[PDB]
Amino acid sequence: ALCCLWSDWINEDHPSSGSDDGDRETFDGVCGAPEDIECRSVKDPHLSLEQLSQKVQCDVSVGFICKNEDQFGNGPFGLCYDYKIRVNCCWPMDC
Ligand SMILES: [Ca+2]
Ligand SMILES: [Ca+2]
Ligand code: NA
């Protein structure tokens, strides 16, 4: 069968850190090919993305991407929340 486990939280980028003007989280070095991914805001971790307001990308191919300019605001106001991810990874095991 397949034995699947959820990783610890990954939170290596932040909306006002680095040079990417956003928040990107990857599972490189954690799992080779996640079966699932969970992307959550740090300040409201119980809300799924379908319960959040921001424009983000969250999938098992690229991981998590939020770009600050995609968020609601006028002028320079408005940016990504800080997000964190878990990945669900499965191993072929007889668990
Ligand atoms: Ca950043
Ligand atoms: Ca982050
Ligand atoms: Na975005």
Residues with CB under 5 Å of ion ligand 1 are 13, 17-18, 20
Distances (CA, A) of 7 to 21, 22, 37, 52, 84: 26, 23, 9, 22, 11
Residue pair 83/64 in contact by the 8 Å Cβ criterion: yes
Q: How many residues does the chain have?
A: 95
Structure determined by: X-ray
Ligand index nearest the alpha carbon of residue 83: 2
23 is in an annotated binding site: yes
Cα(87)–Cα(33) distance, integer angstroms: 9
How far the first Cα of the chain sits from its last, in Å, is 8
Of the bound ligands, which one is closest to the alpha carbon of residue 78?
A: 3
Q: Of the ligands numbered here, which is closest to the C-alpha atom of 58? A: 3
CA distance linking residue 67 with residue 79, whole number of Å: 8
Whether 13 has a binding-site annotation, put simply, is yes
Which resolution, in Å, applies to this structure? 1.5
Strand partners, 67: 22
